[PDB]
Amino acid sequence: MVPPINCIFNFLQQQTPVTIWLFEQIGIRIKGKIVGFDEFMNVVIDEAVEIPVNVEKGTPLGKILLKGDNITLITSA
Amino acid sequence: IFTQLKKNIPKTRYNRDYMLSMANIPERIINVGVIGPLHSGKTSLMDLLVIDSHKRIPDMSKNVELGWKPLRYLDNLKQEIDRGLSIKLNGSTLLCTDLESKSRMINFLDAPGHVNFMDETAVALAASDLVLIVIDVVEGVTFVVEQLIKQSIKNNVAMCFVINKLDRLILDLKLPPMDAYLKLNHIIANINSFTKGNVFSPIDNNIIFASTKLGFTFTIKEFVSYYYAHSIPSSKIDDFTTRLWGSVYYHKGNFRTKPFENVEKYPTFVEFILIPLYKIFSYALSMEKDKLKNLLRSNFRVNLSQEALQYDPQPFLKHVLQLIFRQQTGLVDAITRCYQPFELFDNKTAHLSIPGKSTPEGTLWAHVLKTVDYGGAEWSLVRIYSGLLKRGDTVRILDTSQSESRQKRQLHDDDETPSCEVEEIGLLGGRYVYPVHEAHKGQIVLIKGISSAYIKSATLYSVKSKEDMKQLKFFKPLDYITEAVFKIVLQPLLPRELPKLLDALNKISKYYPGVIIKVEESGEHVILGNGELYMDCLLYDLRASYAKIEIKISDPLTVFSESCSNESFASIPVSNLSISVAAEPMDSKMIQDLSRNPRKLSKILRTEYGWDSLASRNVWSFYNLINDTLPDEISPELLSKYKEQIIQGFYWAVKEGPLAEEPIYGVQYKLLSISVPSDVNIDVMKSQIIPLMKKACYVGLLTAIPILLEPIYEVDITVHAPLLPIVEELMKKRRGSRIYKTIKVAGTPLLEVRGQVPVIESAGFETDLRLSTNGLGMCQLYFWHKIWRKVPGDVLDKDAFIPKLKPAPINSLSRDFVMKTRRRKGISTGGPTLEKYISAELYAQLRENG
Amino acid sequence: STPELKKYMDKKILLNINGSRKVAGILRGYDIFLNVVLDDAMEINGEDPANNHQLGLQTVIRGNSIISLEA
Amino acid sequence: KKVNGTSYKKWSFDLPEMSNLYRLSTPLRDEVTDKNYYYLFDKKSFFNGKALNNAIPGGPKFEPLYPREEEEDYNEFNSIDRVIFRVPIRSEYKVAFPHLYNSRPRSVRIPWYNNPVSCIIQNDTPALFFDPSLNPIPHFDFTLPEDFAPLLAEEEELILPNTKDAMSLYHSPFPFNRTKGKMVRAQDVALAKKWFLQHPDEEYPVKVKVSYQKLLKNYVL
Amino acid sequence: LANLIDYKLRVLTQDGRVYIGQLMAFDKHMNLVLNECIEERVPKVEKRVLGLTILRGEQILSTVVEDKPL
Amino acid sequence: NGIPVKLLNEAQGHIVSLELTTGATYRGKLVESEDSMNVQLRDVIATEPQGAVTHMDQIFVRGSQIKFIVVPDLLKNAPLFKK
RNA sequence: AAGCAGCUUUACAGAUCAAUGGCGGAGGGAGGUCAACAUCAAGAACUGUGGGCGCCUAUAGAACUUAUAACGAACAUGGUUCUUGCCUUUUACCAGAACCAUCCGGGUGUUGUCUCCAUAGAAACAGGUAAAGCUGUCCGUUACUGUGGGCUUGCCAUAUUUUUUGGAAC
Numbered sequence A: 001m002v003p004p005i006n007c008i009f010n011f012l013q014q015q016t017p018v019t020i021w022l023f024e025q026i027g028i029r030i031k032g033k034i035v036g037f038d039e040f041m042n043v044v045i046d047e048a049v050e051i052p053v054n055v056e057k058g059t060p061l062g063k064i065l066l067k068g069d070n071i072t073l074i075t076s077a
Numbered sequence B: 001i002f003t004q005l006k007k008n009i010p011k012t013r014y015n016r017d018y019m020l021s022m023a024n025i026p027e028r029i030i031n032v033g034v035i036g037p038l039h040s041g042k043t044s045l046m047d048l049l050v051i052d053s054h055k056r057i058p059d060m061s062k063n064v065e066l067g068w069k070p071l072r073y074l075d076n077l078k079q080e081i082d083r084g085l086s087i088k089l090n091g092s093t094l095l096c097t098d099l100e101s102k103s104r105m106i107n108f109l110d111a112p113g114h115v116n117f118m119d120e121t122a123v124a125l126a127a128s129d130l131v132l133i134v135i136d137v138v139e140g141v142t143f144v145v146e147q148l149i150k151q152s153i154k155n156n157v158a159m160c161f162v163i164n165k166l167d168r169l170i171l172d173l174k175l176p177p178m179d180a181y182l183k184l185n186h187i188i189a190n191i192n193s194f195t196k197g198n199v200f201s202p203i204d205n206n207i208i209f210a211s212t213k214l215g216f217t218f219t220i221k222e223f224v225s226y227y228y229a230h231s232i233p234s235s236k237i238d239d240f241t242t243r244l245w246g247s248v249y250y251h252k253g254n255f256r257t258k259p260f261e262n263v264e265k266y267p268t269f270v271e272f273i274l275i276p277l278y279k280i281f282s283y284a285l286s287m288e289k290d291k292l293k294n295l296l297r298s299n300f301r302v303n304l305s306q307e308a309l310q311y312d313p314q315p316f317l318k319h320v321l322q323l324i325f326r327q328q329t330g331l332v333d334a335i336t337r338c339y340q341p342f343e344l345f346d347n348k349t350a351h352l353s354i355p356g357k358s359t360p361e362g363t364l365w366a367h368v369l370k371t372v373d374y375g376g377a378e379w380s381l382v383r384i385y386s387g388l389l390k391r392g393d394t395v396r397i398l399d400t401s402q403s404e405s406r407q408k409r410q411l412h413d414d415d416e417t418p419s420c421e422v423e424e425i426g427l428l429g430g431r432y433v434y435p436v437h438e439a440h441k442g443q444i445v446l447i448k449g450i451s452s453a454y455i456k457s458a459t460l461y462s463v464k465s466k467e468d469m470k471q472l473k474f475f476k477p478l479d480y481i482t483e484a485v486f487k488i489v490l491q492p493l494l495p496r497e498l499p500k501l502l503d504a505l506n507k508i509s510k511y512y513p514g515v516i517i518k519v520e521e522s523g524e525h526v527i528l529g530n531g532e533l534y535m536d537c538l539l540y541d542l543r544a545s546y547a548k549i550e551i552k553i554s555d556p557l558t559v560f561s562e563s564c565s566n567e568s569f570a571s572i573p574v575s576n577l578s579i580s581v582a583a584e585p586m587d588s589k590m591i592q593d594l595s596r597n598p599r600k601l602s603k604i605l606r607t608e609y610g611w612d613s614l615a616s617r618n619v620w621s622f623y624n625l626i627n628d629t630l631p632d633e634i635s636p637e638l639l640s641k642y643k644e645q646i647i648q649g650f651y652w653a654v655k656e657g658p659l660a661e662e663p664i665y666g667v668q669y670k671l672l673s674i675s676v677p678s679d680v681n682i683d684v685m686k687s688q689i690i691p692l693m694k695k696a697c698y699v700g701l702l703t704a705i706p707i708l709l710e711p712i713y714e715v716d717i718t719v720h721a722p723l724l725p726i727v728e729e730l731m732k733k734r735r736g737s738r739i740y741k742t743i744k745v746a747g748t749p750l751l752e753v754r755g756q757v758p759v760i761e762s763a764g765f766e767t768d769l770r771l772s773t774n775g776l777g778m779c780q781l782y783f784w785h786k787i788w789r790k791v792p793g794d795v796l797d798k799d800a801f802i803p804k805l806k807p808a809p810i811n812s813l814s815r816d817f818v819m820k821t822r823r824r825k826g827i828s829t830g831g832p833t834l835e836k837y838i839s840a841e842l843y844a845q846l847r848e849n850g
Numbered sequence C: 001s002t003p004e005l006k007k008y009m010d011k012k013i014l015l016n017i018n019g020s021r022k023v024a025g026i027l028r029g030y031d032i033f034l035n036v037v038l039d040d041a042m043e044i045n046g047e048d049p050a051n052n053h054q055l056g057l058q059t060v061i062r063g064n065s066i067i068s069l070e071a
Numbered sequence D: 001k002k003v004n005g006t007s008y009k010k011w012s013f014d015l016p017e018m019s020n021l022y023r024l025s026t027p028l029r030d031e032v033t034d035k036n037y038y039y040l041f042d043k044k045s046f047f048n049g050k051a052l053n054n055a056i057p058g059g060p061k062f063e064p065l066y067p068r069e070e071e072e073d074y075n076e077f078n079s080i081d082r083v084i085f086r087v088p089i090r091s092e093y094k095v096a097f098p099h100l101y102n103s104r105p106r107s108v109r110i111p112w113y114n115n116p117v118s119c120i121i122q123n124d125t126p127a128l129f130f131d132p133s134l135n136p137i138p139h140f141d142f143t144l145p146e147d148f149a150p151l152l153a154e155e156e157e158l159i160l161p162n163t164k165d166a167m168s169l170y171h172s173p174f175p176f177n178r179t180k181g182k183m184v185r186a187q188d189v190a191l192a193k194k195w196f197l198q199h200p201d202e203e204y205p206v207k208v209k210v211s212y213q214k215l216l217k218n219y220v221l
Numbered sequence E: 001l002a003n004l005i006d007y008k009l010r011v012l013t014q015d016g017r018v019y020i021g022q023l024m025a026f027d028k029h030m031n032l033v034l035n036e037c038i039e040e041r042v043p044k045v046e047k048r049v050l051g052l053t054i055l056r057g058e059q060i061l062s063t064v065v066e067d068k069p070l
Numbered sequence F: 001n002g003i004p005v006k007l008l009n010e011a012q013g014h015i016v017s018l019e020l021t022t023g024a025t026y027r028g029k030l031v032e033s034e035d036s037m038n039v040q041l042r043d044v045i046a047t048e049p050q051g052a053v054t055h056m057d058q059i060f061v062r063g064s065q066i067k068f069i070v071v072p073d074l075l076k077n078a079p080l081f082k083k
Numbered sequence G: 001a002a003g004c005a006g007c008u009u010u011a012c013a014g015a016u017c018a019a020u021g022g023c024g025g026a027g028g029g030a031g032g033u034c035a036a037c038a039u040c041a042a043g044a045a046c047u048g049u050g051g052g053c054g055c056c057u058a059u060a061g062a063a064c065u066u067a068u069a070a071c072g073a074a075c076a077u078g079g080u081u082c083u084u085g086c087c088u089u090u091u092a093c094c095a096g097a098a099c100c101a102u103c104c105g106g107g108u109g110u111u112g113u114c115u116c117c118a119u120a121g122a123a124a125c126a127g128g129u130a131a132a133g134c135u136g137u138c139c140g141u142u143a144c145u146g147u148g149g150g151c152u153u154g155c156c157a158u159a160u161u162u163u164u165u166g167g168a169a170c
């Protein structure tokens, strides 16, 4: 019943660290806090750290404006 | 093999071959079963859809092509044509389209508008999972349409309302546009007022604005989809449709609930639709055809033919409307948006028979609704709920007169079920039947061979396994919206023609379902129709069409129902085992509630209205009325062993009153005392229980000072203002004829007066009403309320003055009713009292001393 | 046009998504963009196990990534 | 062009001239236009009045088709004791419902029953004006372009000067209902036919009413 | 393109497959509906019979005229 | 723009064979078709491009991933194509 | 609903100025209280009789419809048989029934005439039926351009998940 835009807004209020899977790319999964998003669901992530699946390390990416089209799977971690 | 058989059927715009391929899918078949009050345009609207679908009808002449005389396609009967009404259901199978060009096939059924035919309307509701209630503007929302809304809500059937005869308010009334929109606000206001759980309007695709005589049906979404889809982008067009209807205004791109100081208040239905419509009419009858032709070539993209330009004003207007409002895809769209298969169909089929779990997919299970004569041959109108039905298959059939017996037989769980072969299958096309190899789920079809097994309504099934026979649920007998109390005794004038007449009556019981035919042992036949005109159609159809015989016909009579007034003063043992049964009238609301487990029952009874936990706890049963048990000796399980038998003898006791041997109504029987002898033999025990039960209940009423109950036609009348007093005078001409509320119909001179007239007093009361009103009034007699009132006067009156050839005084009435009913049933043989019911002698002396 | 998922509401549905991805979760929300809100987000890893990624923290997945969904 | 030619076989008219002829012909055309007003004065109803030997008090009385001989001899059926006498079931009912109220009718034509009640309002006032005889009516994409005004905009008034005359003429009887038609000989025009087909108004001299009955007699015959 | 109605068309999609059939109708998106359309891949070899079909205007690459109208 | 979509609308209740972008084919009765080409089938049998076959009950697949849908030949003559 | 382009035409300058292809034409249009001649509700499975190819065109012979209200929004008059009063005879009859007939009139369709309105022409030739460009030849513009009209069309507004502004490349 909860619409996905207001659900993403709920993750925005909760601020919990968010794991995002990208589109047609299984190698990298980005982690970090959601500081905001737009109506296009382009999300600016805070404390972004890569998570290569190819034992999981990462390089801290800082804050990011991430285009919603590549955004596939939004979760918390 | 049947290719040479047809040759008659008219070629249809869509091919008929694809329609059955569409019929193979249960999702694509919606049954409309259009409904509405008398002369609402039903048969004419169905005619619009038939002419719409087919190419060229062979039975339409040039005159009905111009539209002077409205073509009624779906009534092929001689009487239906001459008498001008509809009688028997004849629908159509029409592949139709929405605003989306998606084509859903539809089975239409036109139920007659006159109320005495409401039996066919009940068959239409049970048949159709959707309902189009066709409402006249000037008649407003009548009480009949109210009964159709409440009735369709009762059996859980979707409703899509068609407001009809706009061209009447526009021409006859000549309503100013704003005032006419106020009229529509009044119609829809009452509509949503009587519909509890739904909101109907032009938005949401429910209300359908139509005029059948001039042949156009449109919905605001269809209309905007036509002529506003050019200017409006696809983005805002949907919301724009949703906001059209009311409490909004427009100037330029601006919307306010207030007129915002503009010179004109046109609440966006007036201005955007209703005003263009009015200008279409006024210009059509008025404006010069050259510049009008220029408008149609400009605005609506309409090109008029020279032959069209040369038409008379009315046919030309009809033609212009058929060009502006194109072939009707809007009404079908409203049909689709109205009906949702889930949340309904399962609820429906659960309401018609029993709540249960789905249906076995293998077995074929179909309701047999109505037996129709069509080409002069016996047919059967059958709706397939599950499974596929093949031509030449052997199928089981059960008249719904035996249903609950079989269901109890399964609750205690070869076959007694008579089987018949399907000779042919057809899809009703109106004037033609289109034969089809096989019938599928969720559609309405005709079958020749079924008609012999069942009296009126049946269940039709073929199982592939016995566990299905365990899992089959059977349809309850059809509940006819109105009970038929109108009574006429028939005899053939030549008694030697009696046997053939018998066959005729059988056919009648099949062809007219709501007729209740009773065969009296005195040889005088009895027929119960809903009302005057329905029984008349019965007679003309019976004599001319089926069995041609000179038939003597008694004056119209009624069914009386015996009852009790006060409480039985004495509890009388009854022997040939001595039972004394006390009687008492039902509560007022208890009756109305009754006409329309044990812990829930006692809670509903007691809770809802006054009872004692012992009484409400000990209620044994209810029928048609309620048998109760209140001794202190209930302790033995004996009364539980014989309880079923007591309910049986109670059935035979209630089916025949002590006075006229007529159904007992509104009477509660509480058992005060039941004696059992020392020795017990179950055969003589029970077989001596039944007569003591019947005699017991008779003594029950007679000690209660019984009263007769006459039925009451509820009367709906439409008159004008100046002619109102005359009608009232008529109401003083009859013993009955109470007037209750005089309803002003908005924007029309017609005052619709409600009333109640007893069926004895009302004979041709419609006709006398019309002659007295010089055709400006209209009367309708509708008894579905099953309301009974006491005829004034006391039964068991030794001295009452009854004029032989003249009507009797008021206070003596019930006495002559009892006498004359007893004689017509030959009960008199010459005040029943208690003597034949064994007050005995010494005890009879004692009651005479009191 | 709002897609009608109403018959999938509060039901366990198995999405398949671009990149040979397979999700299983109970439907919660949706929209005209068809983006889905799932509860009890369950990844199907390459072979044997099925990773339960989200329990009460649910999830949202963009629409166009969806190959399909089964009930 | 209004007529077929010099042979003068056909005629076609415009609205206003036909309206003129109508307002001139009001004295000779009593405006009986309501069909429901004819109840029991249909030709069907008179034929049934002949076959049933039942005379509407306004209608003509005829010789019975079948001489009245009674073979009943009072069987058990329709006996004085059996039936209930309440309603007078006078002749009007017998011509109303031919089969039900009457026993053994022969060669009886089914009547029309009725059309819907006529709500027509004749003006005596602008076109499309609210009649004081009517009952009062109780009551209870926001952007768009600057264009898109409702259909038939710029058409100015909704009611043209002739539209009242158009609506009043739309309900006119067979003669005036049409803007075209065939020619009929003066021999073939019945002007006085529409006068005796009406219900005779009360307080006519009895001789006048008898004249109505005779005219109806010849007509139905 | 309306001029091209009913002509047998040989169409090639983004997946490299060739579909042959009479074009019954199209739209703005170039969604085509093909009568008795047959599938083919390698070339005749590896051919299949779809029948009446509708191909999307997004995955289509190009189409060419095949045979005569009827 | 009417015919291609409106056709897929009229295909409800008809056995259809979807082929998708990945190549897995879904055959079965079409329960519902949204105007955006998002389609919903019941009684679906699936064939993977590698040849793997499974049977499934309720499937709902987006428009954007549909390679094409094949509908039965009964619709060859339908009121849609009549102008 | 403007403009652009496409389509159809068009007054046309045109390619060809050939074989073509399209649309029309190979016997006008109104009118006449102008004639003559045929018929006069539409159906029709089904059959038969013929043509055109189990289907349409033409006919009658039953089924199975209502003629209906109204070849005519009118409606007279006789004849025959039956019944009712005059009655008792020829008339003449009052009032009905059934079946016939006479008259007043009308739509058509075919032709013939007799008056208004027209301008290409190819309205030329040969085949036959109950009918006609019905067929074959045939000719007018012309089948490919630009100016001028109309629309049956798309743009004049969409780069943010479901289509066209690609998640490809390798």
Ligand SMILES: Nc1nc2c(ncn2[C@@H]2O[C@H](COP(=O)(O)OP(=O)(O)OP(=O)(O)O)[C@@H](O)[C@H]2O)c(=O)[nH]1
Binding pocket: B037, B038, B039, B040, B041, B042, B043, B044, B045, B070, B072, B084, B085, B086, B111, B112, B113, B114, B164, B165, B166, B167, B168, B210, B211, B212, B213, B214, D116
């Ligand atoms: N003035 C006017 N009369 C109409 C209009 N539509 C229908 N009527 C009349 O209403 C009558 C009843 O319509 P029908 O369809 O023939 O019959 P019905 O409405 O089904 O009535 P029943 O057959 O008894 O159920 C028609 O005969 C028309 O004369 C209308 O739009 N305007």
